[PDB]
Design a protein around this ligand. Structure first.
Ligand code: U35
Ligand code: NAG
Length: 343
C-alpha cells in the first residue's frame, strides 16, 4: 500500500484550503521514481465549482482522504501486474485543484477557492528530495485524463526546478495517458471556451516556450497536445485511444449512418496524423475510457507489442532497436478493428 503524507507547507492547498498531499511507497533498492497525476475533469466558475463541491468533494478537499491506497497497473509493485517498473518508488498525487494541474492562485478575500495545481507538483517534488528523491536517476512524471494533460503542462517545469535546486543528474521524463485532445468541430452543435474561462479563473500557467508562441489571451492553445508537445524539451511518451470516449462526448457522439460513419473515420485519421511526428507513442484503434492504472493494462497490443513492452523499449532508447519498437499507432479505421481492445 501507498501511505498518505499531507504537505508540510500547509499553504499549498486543495480548492477549499485544506492541505494537499501525496501517497508514497518507497523501494530502497531502486533509483527510479514514478510520480502519477490523477485526473477528473475541472471546474471553471463559482457556480460550476460549487456543484462539484457538493458531489465530488474528494476532488476539492483532503478532509475525507483515506490513510492508504493500493497501487494498481503501472503503480503496482507486483511483476505480474507491472512488467515495466514494478521495483520503482511509487507516488500517487491526488487531484484536488480542479484546474488541469495549471493553477497558481490562493484562496483570499477575493477568491472563494484556491487553484494551486502547478504549485502542488512543485511542493511534492521539493518534499520528496529529503525522502530519497535526491538519489534518483530517473523521475517519470505520469498521469491520466486531466492528469495526462497535466504532464504536458508541467514536465519541463519539474526539470527546470531540479536544475535550479542543484540536482542535475536526475533525468526528468513524461508519460501522458488519455490527455491528447483535438479542438475539432462537433458532430452536433464549448470546450475551448471553458478552458479559456478556466485559465482566467485559476490564474493558470502554461509552459514558457508555448506561451511565447501563442501570446496573451491565447494560452488555451497550450492545453492541446499537438500544439504544446513540439515545444517541450523533456522526453514524453504519449498514450491515446484513437476513439477516446471523452473526445467523443465533447463532440456530441453517442446502426450508424453515413454522416456519422464519416465523422468517426475522420476523427481517427486526424488523431493518427497528429502522432506521426511523436516517436514514442501507443495509440490503439479502440473506443475506450480505460487508463494505465487499471490492473489489466498489460492486455492491449498494437502490432503485437504491449504498452509495458513499448515503455521498456523507450527506456532502452534513452540510454531503432531490433524487435523493440516505440512508435505504435494503429492504422485500421474503425473502433475494435484491433482484436485486443478492452471489452
Ligand atoms: C476538446 C477538449 C476535450 C477534453 C475535455 O473536454 N475534457 C473535459 C471533459 C469533462 C467532462 C466530460 C464528460 C462529460 C459528461 C459525461 C462524460 C464525460 C466524460 N469524461 N470522460 N469520458 N466522458 C468529458 C470531458 C478533458 C477531460 O477531463 O477529459 C479536460 C482534461 C480538458
Ligand atoms: C509555502 O508555499 C507558499 C505558496 O506556494 C510559498 O509562497 C511559501 O514560500 C512556502 N513556504 C515555505 C517555507 O516553503
Amino acid at each position: 500500500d501507498l501511505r498518505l503524507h499531507l504537505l508540510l507547507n500547509t499553504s499549498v492547498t486543495c480548492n477549499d484550503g485544506s492541505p494537499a498531499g501525496y501517497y508514497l511507497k518507497e523501494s530502497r533498492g531502486s533509483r527510479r521514481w514514478l510520480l502519477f497525476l490523477e485526473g477528473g475533469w475541472y471546474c471553471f466558475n463559482r457556480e460550476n465549482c460549487d456543484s462539484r463541491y457538493d458531489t465530488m468533494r474528494r476532488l476539492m478537499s483532503s478532509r475525507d482522504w483515506p490513510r492508504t491506497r493500493t497501487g494498481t497497473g503501472i503503480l503496482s509493485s507486483q511483476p505480474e501486474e507491472n512488467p515495466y517498473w514494478w521495483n520503482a518508488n511509487m507516488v500517487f498525487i491526488p487531484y484536488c485543484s480542479s484546474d488541469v494541474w495549471s493553477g497558481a492562485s490562493s484562496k483570499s478575500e477575493k477568491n472563494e477557492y484556491a487553484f494551486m495545481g502547478a504549485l502542488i507538483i512543485q511542493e511534492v517534488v521539493r518534499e520528496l528530495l529529503g525522502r530519497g528523491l535526491s538519489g534518483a536517476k530517473v523521475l517519470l512524471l505520469a498521469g491520466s485524463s486531466a492528469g495526462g494533460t497535466g504532464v504536458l503542462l508541467n514536465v519541463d517545469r519539474v526539470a527546470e526546478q531540479l536544475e535550479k535546486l542543484g540536482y542535475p543528474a536526475i533525468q526528468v521524463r513524461g508519460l501522458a495517458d488519455s490527455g491528447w485532445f483535438l479542438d475539432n468541430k462537433q458532430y452536433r452543435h464549448a470546450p475551448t471556451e471553458a478552458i479559456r474561462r478556466g485559465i482566467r479563473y485559476w490564474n493558470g500557467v502554461v509552459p514558457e516556450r508555448c506561451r511565447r508562441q501563442f501570446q496573451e489571451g491565447e494560452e488555451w492553445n497550450c492545453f492541446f497536445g499537438y500544439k504544446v508537445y513540439p515545444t517541450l524539451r523533456s522526453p514524453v511518451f504519449v498514450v491515446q485511444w484513437l476513439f477516446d470516449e471523452a473526445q467523443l462526448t465533447v463532440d456530441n457522439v453517442h446502426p450508424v449512418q453515413e454522416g456519422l460513419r464519416l465523422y468517426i473515420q475522420n476523427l481517427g485519421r486526424e488523431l493518427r496524423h497528429t502522432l506521426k511526428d511523436v516517436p514514442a507513442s501507443f495509440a490503439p484503434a479502440c473506443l475506450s475510457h480505460e487508463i494505465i492504472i487499471r490492473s489489466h493494462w498489460t492486455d492491449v497490443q498494437v502490432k503485437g507489442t504491449s504498452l509495458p513492452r513499448a515503455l521498456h523499449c523507450w527506456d532502452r532508447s534513452l540510454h531503432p532497436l531490433k524487435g523493440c519498437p516505440v512508435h505504435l499507432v494503429d492504422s485500421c479505421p474503425w473502433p475494435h478493428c484491433n482484436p485486443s481492445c478492452p471489452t
